[PDB]
Amino acid sequence: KILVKQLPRLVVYNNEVNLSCKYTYNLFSKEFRASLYKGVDSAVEVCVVNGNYSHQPQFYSSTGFDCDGKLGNETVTFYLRNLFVNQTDIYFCKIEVMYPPPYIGNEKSNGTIIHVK
């Protein structure tokens, strides 16, 4: 699989963070789907970004966060704004790559503790 590396705790007073998830895998011309989840459970998607790495595909949040982002050969950097102290927990970076096969995800990250203060 693809192994993810994240900083082990970010700590925030801006109420805003920039959180890059370094992979061991070149996402250059690959169709993929990169995500980030809040929770020990990992059961809230904070951003998806997905599409072909060719045409710069748009980050967004169903779950309700102000969330841009920028993708690069081996890195995926999320950008969360407007975060609350209510919302300091762990965040898990996560890729699936669809094309070209074979289709693979990533071995589960350690996560970062985002601590918002």
Epitope: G51, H55, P57, Q58, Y60, S62, K70, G72, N73
Partner: antibody, heavy 113, light 113 residues
């Protein structure tokens, strides 16, 4: 079914009125990619107005384009809209919708005022 | 607010003559990403513009190997390796690091009997 952006027709509008200009997206997924809007006055060059987030809706505007210009989406019919308001002769140009990494652009939609 | 600048508004080549087109920058457009955030564009006349290079070095689909994007991370050049008559037009560089995005001035690439 090549990817293909396709935009509203030409406009001849006189000052102090509304207009929406449509851009209809085809061939490709759509809410996965962002959507820029780009002004080109006639003998001058290209200017970036901003973009709308096809999933989230949220538009960002370039500073000069702040007020009176407005972007918006019918997301299930794959179509985006610029709407310009209280129009001023300033605002005559061809107007480009574009997406997919600025790799696919529209026809162009020529407004005159 | 980044200001892009092509210092070469018009440049007459003859065919076969290789040319290279500069576009300098206020900030550096390199990123922790490792990528560097420049598009290069060609608006042939009447035509909508078409993406040619993206992330400085990389060139998009349906574009000739003639075209090359080279770059120091605040100064950048588009080598066109051997000018085909088709390739004449205005070329626009465009930074995409920080909002607002900003286009160059253009550089008309005139072609001459």
């Amino acid at each position: 079914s090549q990817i293909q952006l396709v935009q509203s027709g030409p406009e001849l509008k006189k000052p102090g009125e509304t207009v929406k200009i449509s851009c209809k997206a085809s061939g490709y997924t759509f809410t996965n990619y962002g959507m820029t809007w780009v002004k080109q006055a006639p003998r001058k060059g290209l200017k970036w107005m901003g973009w709308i987030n096809t999933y989230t809706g949220r538009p960002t505007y370039a500073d000069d384009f702040k007020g009176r210009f407005a972007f918006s989406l019918e997301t299930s019919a794959s179509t985006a809209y610029l709407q310009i308001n209280n129009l001023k002769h300033e605002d005559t140009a061809t107007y480009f919708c574009a997406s997919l990494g600025e790799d696919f652009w529209g026809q162009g939609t020529t407004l005159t005022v | 607010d980044i200001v892009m600048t092509q210092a070469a508004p018009s440049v007459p080549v003859t065919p076969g003559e290789s040319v290279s087109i500069s576009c300098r920058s206020t900030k550096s457009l390199l990123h922790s990403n490792g990528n560097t955030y420049l598009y290069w564009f060609l608006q042939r006349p009447g035509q909508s513009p078409q993406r040619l290079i993206y992330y400085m070095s990389n060139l998009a689909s349906g574009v000739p190997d003639r075209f090359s994007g080279r770059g120091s991370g605040t100064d950048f050049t588009l080598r066109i390796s051997r000018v085909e008559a088709e390739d004449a037009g205005v070329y626009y560089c465009m930074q995409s690091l920080e909002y607002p995005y900003t286009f160059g001035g253009g550089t008309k690439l005139e072609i001459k009997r």
